[PDB]
């Protein structure tokens, strides 16, 4: 099937630079013109670069002209976006998008879009989370199920990755949206298990934060 | 300049026939445009390309329920028998090449709600401060709010039955399967946690209220 897979997003400081790639598969990539479109945290879409199927035409809007360079390697079925002199307002989700085959329309429609890669340009300070185990108040241990949790407190930037029992415990897991307070995120995940399994069996949350190169495993104890 | 104008929101009853309007700037009133659909947690999806005469060509895997038409500078997306999965943001898009400069303009998007769906009431999970955090003289109470639909909730906290204003942080709701979820945190000192008889997470959703309380005692 048609796939376009973006990678390369991350945190960069203002003035910094970053290079995004988009691997295409499942269609004849060198027959298609390609663009990068970004989406702000407030959800507004903005077209930021176009390159034709053989690379003869490239265009950019005024907001990135002179800072961004789009290119492609047809031998590897890959599109790139080199970004430099980055500004805080370049923070956005970046999508690689395929224009409709030119034989179908000579106009502009973007008929397939990737899942996106997230870019954050910020001078806010990188901070590893504090990770606390959440066991229920005694009053909440009397059910047929029991819900344990994990509090991931005060980190920046997003994301963290969180699993339970290293990924082997997957059913009944819910990881909740983070709040943002003073340049630091906070989130919590929970796992619901039948009350016979805990605490007779072990339940641990695994919290990685790539940007600080940290990882914490917290066993939930009564 | 080249401009696309669309309402920021619309709602329609489940099963109804819905119509969205995108309007072109006057001097571009003859342009071919596209419609995109963005559902929560997904990229935009191509719906159709639509011409000044109303003829259109729809993208892969778009139901027969979607169709397009036009009237002067207006471009319409019509959805017969609107379904719960048609809840999405709809965005129109339009291109041109002017003096050999490519330009591409998006509308602001129309956030579409499908009314008349059956409700789902929030379930609350509340956690006390860990002893590990309490040792640092801090207490974060956690309220995890899930399995609700539609997505609008209002969250408030109480201590001994009296409202708390300060130290509350409540997230936006996020889609999870066919419902929503959200979280709220109450930040206290250890002395505050220890000194009250109870705290309550309280969630208002569509005329209903759900509360769950916990106590430092026993």
């Amino acid at each position: 099937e048609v796939q376009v897979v973006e990678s390369g997003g991350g945190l960069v400081k203002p003035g910094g630079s970053l290079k995004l790639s988009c691997a295409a598969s499942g269609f004849a990539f060198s027959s298609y013109d390609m663009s990068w479109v970004r989406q702000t945290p407030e959800k507004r879409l903005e077209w930021v670069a176009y390159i034709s199927r053989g690379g003869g035409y490239t265009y950019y809007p005024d907001t990135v002209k002179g800072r961004f360079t789009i290119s492609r390697d047809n031998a590897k079925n890959t599109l790139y976006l080199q970004m430099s002199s980055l500004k805080s307002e370049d923070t956005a989700m970046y999508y690689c998008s395929r224009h409709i085959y030119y034989g179908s329309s000579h106009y502009y429609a973007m008929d397939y879009w990737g899942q996106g890669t997230s870019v954050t340009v910020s001078s806010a300070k990188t901070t590893a989370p504090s990770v606390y185990p959440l066991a229920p108040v005694c009053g909440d241990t009397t059910g047929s199920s029991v819900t344990l949790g994990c509090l991931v407190k005060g980190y920046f930037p997003e994301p963290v990755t969180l699993t339970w029992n290293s990924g082997s415990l997957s059913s009944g897991v819910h990881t909740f949206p983070a709040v943002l307070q003073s340049d630091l995120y906070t989130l919590s995940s929970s796992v619901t298990v039948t009350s016979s399994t805990w605490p007779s069996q072990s339940i641990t949350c695994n919290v990685a934060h790539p940007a600080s190169s940290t990882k914490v495993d917290k066993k939930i104890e009564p | 300049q080249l401009v696309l104008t669309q309402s920021s929101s619309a709602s329609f009853s489940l099963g109804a026939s819905a119509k969205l309007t995108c309007t072109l700037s006057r001097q571009h009133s003859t342009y071919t445009i596209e419609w995109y659909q963005q559902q929560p947690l997904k990229p935009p999806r191509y719906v159709m390309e639509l011409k000044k005469d109303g003829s259109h060509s729809t993208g892969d895997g778009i139901p027969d329920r979607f169709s397009g038409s036009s009237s002067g500078a207006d471009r319409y997306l019509s959805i017969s028998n609107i379904q719960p999965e048609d809840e999405a943001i709809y965005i129109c898009g339009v291109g041109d090449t002017i003096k050999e400069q490519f330009v591409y303009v998006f509308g602001g998007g129309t956030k579409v709600t499908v009314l008349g769906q059956p409700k789902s009431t929030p379930t609350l999970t509340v956690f006390p401060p860990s002893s590990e955090e309490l040792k640092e003289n801090k207490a974060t109470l956690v309220c995890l709010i899930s399995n609700f639909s539609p997505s609008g909730v209002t969250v408030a906290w109480k201590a001994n039955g009296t409202p708390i204003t300060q130290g509350v942080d409540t997230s936006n709701p996020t889609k999870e399967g066919n419902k929503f979820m959200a979280s709220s945190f109450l930040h206290l000192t250890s002395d505050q946690w220890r000194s009250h008889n109870s705290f309550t997470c309280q969630v208002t959703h569509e005329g209903d209220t759900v509360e769950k309380s916990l106590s430092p005692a026993e």
């Binding site: 013109d33 176009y50 034709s52 199927r53 053989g54 690379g55 003869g56 035409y57 224009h99 030119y102 000579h106 106009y107 502009y108 | 001097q27 571009h28 003859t30 342009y31 071919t32 291109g95 041109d96 090449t97 002017i98 050999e100 490519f102």
Partner: peptide, 11 residues
């Protein structure tokens, strides 16, 4: 104003 096609190699 009349809309123009996008340009692509060998069009």
């Amino acid at each position: 104003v009349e809309q123009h096609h996008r340009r692509t190699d060998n069009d």
